[PDB]
Every structure is written in structure tokens, then in C-alpha cells.
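Journal club prep, notes for RB
We'll compare a predicted complex against what the paper describes. Inputs for the sodium ion case:
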Amino acid sequence: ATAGQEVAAPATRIPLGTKTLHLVDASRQDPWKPSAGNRELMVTLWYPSLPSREPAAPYVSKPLSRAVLGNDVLAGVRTHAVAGARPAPVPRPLVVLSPGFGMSRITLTALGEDLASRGYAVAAVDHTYEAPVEFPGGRIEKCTLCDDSRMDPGAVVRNRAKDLRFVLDRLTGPGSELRVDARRIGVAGHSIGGASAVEVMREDRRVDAAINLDGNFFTEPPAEGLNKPVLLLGARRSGLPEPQENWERAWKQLTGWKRWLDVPAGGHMTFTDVPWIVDRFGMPGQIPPEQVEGQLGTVSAARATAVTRNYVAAFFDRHLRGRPSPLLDRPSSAHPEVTFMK
Ligand code: NA
């Protein structure tokens, strides 16, 4: 089932390293479970490394695979990054990634490694109690907010902005486990993570550019405007009134570089590893039949991964590395699934 199985091949064959970091923000009590203490976060780094002959890191542990999928099969999948490999010479521009609500940061692995293979330092962030998360010493915390109807998505976005600013403090500061080019920082995220990517850019002058991968906004638009680059990349919003109006309200206060793309035949999960997880390793009725259209659409796992990687890389190459791309400006015959809403 998993013998020799891997995540989608990244853009290049450069050596990649990976590290997992346990960060504790001791200035803030945890917003959802303050009895547990201060706000802690788990982060996965992917980065260009020196060559290593060690095997690549697994996608996930067996216990966390059980928590995410319902069985351990994903623990047999290998990535393309070597745990603890020494970083390559020059500090690289940093892209920070935030997952969808209830979803592990591991669901952005194919994207993260791909950006790393293109020459970026990448940090995927877990937001505790908003996903199953594995901490050091085998401690797995549950998505306790997933159960709770008292969850406010605006509160989640506002707190995630604080989480992400703290991650930037740690990765750009003197004690960092990975030296990055702090002059060039991008943030992207899936669903509520995408709303949070834009939110942190509003709050933090160090963030240069942001991508929202199909998240509704849950905070009111800035009255002063947001003049920094934003890509809105959604799924099925061409024929969904509520998602379209949500993004139209945000669009009016985006005062700088901006694009709004749609994947009309995609699904909400198109911008993550979930299509690949479900299509290759999913149980019978992993996503129930009535939700398949909305969550996955008809875009294959391979195309979902390719489209997301290519457009995300195009955006960050444009704003962080001075490289143009026609993908951001006009229809692409190599990506017939992508349309322009503006
Ligand atoms: Na979600």
C-alpha cells in the first residue's frame, strides 16, 4: 500500500532539509484552553539543504496519521526532505503557511516542499486546538474547537495573526534554528489560514505579500485599505453567491497589487494534500458522497497539487524574487481549470 510511496514530486531535485520546532509564546495565554498554559505552536520547516545520504522524513508519525485520517497508512508515505539536514549556504526568502480549520499543517506538505525545492525557506504552522497536533514526547493534542459551537472564526483569524507574528519573531530573530532572509517574507494559507495570511500582513510590516487559498474573510475590511499584494485563489466561487460577496467586500479595500482567480470545477480542499490523501489512501466514504463536489470537485489530486504549486510559486516569485509570470495576468492553456474573476 505504502511501499515506495511518496508525496508528489517537487519542482526541482535540489537537496531539501526539514526540521520540526516546538515554539511557546510565553507572552500569551492559550486563547482556547488557558488552563493548559501559554500559547504553544508546532512548526515544520522545509529548506534547501546540503546533500545528505540519509533517507527522507516520513509524511507523518503513525499516531498522528491515526488522528488525521483514522488509520496509520500516511506514516508509510515518504517526503523528499531529510530530517535535520544542514541548510544550504545563503539565507532564503521565507514563506509561512497556515492550514484550514481542523486540518493539520501536514496537509500543506506537497506545497511546502515544492516551494523549498524552488529555493525558499518554508514554515508550516499548527495552531493548537484547531487541528490534531503532535508535540514532543509523543503528546497529541486534539482539535477541541472542532467540537465547540462557541468557536468564532473572527477570533480564530485574529489569534492566528498573533501566532504567525510570533513565528516570524522566532524565525527571523537571533536564536533561529534556520537563518532566513528576513527582508523577503510571504504568507499563504488554506481556508481560515488564508484569511489569517491576509490578516497578519495587515498587522505586520515585515510581511511583503499574502495568498488566501479559498478562505472567507471573518474580520471587517481595513478602513485605511491594504496596499500590499494579495492573491485570492478560490474554488467554485463563480457559482456561489455568499463566497463571492464575501470576497467582493474584501476586494474593495485592497488598494495595491491584487488578483482574484477561481477554480470553478475544483473544491474547497483542492489547495491542500487532501485530494491526494483521499484519492490514494481514503476509506469508503472518507468524504461523504454529498460533499465530494464542494470539497474535491473534479480536479484530480495530481492537477490540484500542480495548479496550487504553480500559482503559489508564481505569486511569491513575483513579489519576493523579481520574476514575472503570465499565470498571474491572463488565462493559461497549461492550466485550463483556472479562471479570472477580476
Ligand atoms: Na475549513
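Talking point for the session: Residues 153-172 form the longest helix (20 residues).
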